[PDB]
Structure 1
Amino acid sequence: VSLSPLILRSLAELQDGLNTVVDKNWRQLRRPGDWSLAITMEAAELLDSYPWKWWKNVKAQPDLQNVKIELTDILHFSLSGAMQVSDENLADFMFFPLSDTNNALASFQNIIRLASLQRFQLVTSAVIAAADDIGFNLVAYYVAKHTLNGIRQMKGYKDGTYVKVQKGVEDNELLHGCISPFSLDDVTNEGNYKTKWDDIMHRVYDAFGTPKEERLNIGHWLKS
């Protein structure tokens, strides 16, 4: 399973633009090992979405909606790593169906191994395969979380003044509703996808009350 190369390139452009919001000269400041560590830590969030602990709340239920968020986060970081290292310098590492918690725990631990080896392109392929298997719209999730990531930067995430959970709702949870109106074809159609990505962005901006003047539309992010 792979995305169209034109879709992958647009996602990469979005990723570069977001990384530039975080730091103008990120391509000089960041190193491959940074992206390895970030993927590791998202992979721990992903594992922690399951009731893996045999000593703590053993009848807990998995947070399968959060799984989608953490896979999307891994994609942001694997796209970023791939901009710095091609893998030169799947069925062995990923186990389907991921609906089986044993398969998920094994697979997602193997993502950490791939990350440590700086096989970022393979991590991207793993995430695409995982979304295909689970049946969620990875591209739409990406555009939505990309927008939230930018919003967080606007609202002081980098200086420690942001609050992610408010009135019982984590910011990430509001993304599901922003994405549900969009089909896979909507966000991958060769001629029209950019308009649909723009629509996702504005839904996320609405969800967080971003004043119109502070919003960045799809064209901000693309080099095509």
Structure 2
Amino acid sequence: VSLSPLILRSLAELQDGLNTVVDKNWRQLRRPGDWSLAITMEAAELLDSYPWKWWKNVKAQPDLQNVKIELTDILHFSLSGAMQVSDENDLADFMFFPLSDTNNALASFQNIIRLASLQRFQLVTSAVIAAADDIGFNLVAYYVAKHTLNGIRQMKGYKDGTYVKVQKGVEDNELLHGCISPFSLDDVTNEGNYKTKWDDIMHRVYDAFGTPKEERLNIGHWL
């Protein structure tokens, strides 16, 4: 399972743009080990979406909507890693389907950590794409939506430590589900029209956070 090369290239361009918002010279400041750490930490967040602890709240239920967000976060970091180092610098060995089985999920997502530490970023990207295919969620649409939230966060003091993620019982991430649900897989991968659908996802996320029109960045900013 893979995305069209043109779609992947566009996702990579968005990722470079976002990385540039965080730091103009990110390509000189960041190293492969940074992306390995970042993926490791998101993978811990992904694992913590499951009731894996045998000693604490043992009847807890998995947060399967959150799984989607954490996989999307991993993609941002695996795209980033791949921009800096090639894998040169197999999947069915590390991923176990169906991921609806919690034991399969825990094993697979721990293996993402192994792959990250090996700096196999392209393989991590493939693993996330395969996971979204297996779980049956719209990875590309989640990416565009979380990409947009990531930019909003930077606009609202994230680097300064003044941003608050959970407000009035709602985490910013949770608002993304509703922003994406109108969009099909074909909407966001159509060769001719995908960019207008990505632009539409972006506008929906800006709306969800009340971003003033003048501060909004459209799809053209990123490509």
Do both share a fold (TM > 0.5)? yes
What is the CA–CA distance in structure 1 between the aligned matches of 2:7 and 2:203, rounded to whole Å? 20
Cα distance, 1:136 vs structure 2: 0.1
The answer to whether 1:32 aligns with 2:44 is no
Residue deviations 1:72-116 (CA, integer Å, cap 9, x gap)? 000000000000011001000000000000000000000000000
Counterpart CA distance in 2 for 1:70 and 1:92 is 22
Q: What is the Cα deviation at residue 155 of structure 1?
A: 0.3
Deviation at 1:20, TM superposition (A): 0.1
Alignment match, 1:205: 206
Cα displacement string for residues 115-152 of structure 1 (whole angstroms, at most 9, x for unaligned residues): 00000000000000000000000000000000000000
By how many angstroms is 1:33 displaced?
Answer: 0.1
Matches within 5 A, 1:48-197: 48-89=48-89, 90-197=91-198
Deviation at 1:48, TM superposition (A): 0.1
2-side partners of 1:77 and 1:177: how far apart? Answer: 24
1-structure distance, mates of 2:205, 2:62: 25
Identity %: 100
3-state DSSP of counterpart to 1:59: coil
Counterparts of 2:152 and 2:84 in 1: how far apart (Å)?
Answer: 25
Q: Partners in 2 of 1:22 and 1:62 — Cα distance?
A: 32
Root-mean-square deviation (CA, aligned residues, Å) is 0.2
| Helix, strand or coil at the partner of 1:220 | helix
Aligned to 1:162, the other structure's residue is in SS state coil
Corresponding pairs, count: 222
CA distance in 2, matches of 1:85, 1:40: 17
Per-residue CA deviations over 1:34-93 (Å, capped at 9, x if unaligned) read 000000000000000000000000000000000000000000000000000110010000
Q: What is the CA-CA distance between 1:31 and the residue it aligns to?
A: 0.0
- Matched residues in 2 for 1:150 and 1:95: separation? 33
User: C-alpha distance in 2, partners of 1:63/1:189?
Assistant: 30
The secondary structure found in structure 2 opposite 1:76 is helix
Cα distance, 1:153 vs structure 2: 0.2
For structure 1, list consecutive stretches of 5 or more residues without a partner in the other structure: none
Q: CA deviation at 1:214?
A: 0.0
What is the alpha-carbon distance in structure 2 between the residues aligned to residue 172 and residue 161 of structure 1? 17
Task: Report the Cα distance in structure 2 between the residues aligned to 1:139 and 1:44, rounded to whole angstroms.
Answer: 22
Taking the aligned partners of 1:18 and 1:87, their CA distance within structure 2 comes to 22
Distance in 2 separating the partners of 1:56 and 1:216: 44
State the Cα distance separating 1:219 from its structure 2 match: 0.1
Q: Residue 7 of structure 1 aligns with which residue?
A: 7
Which whole-Å CA distance do the structure 1 matches of 2:35 and 2:168 have between them? 32
The 2-side partners of 1:2 and 1:85 are apart by: 20
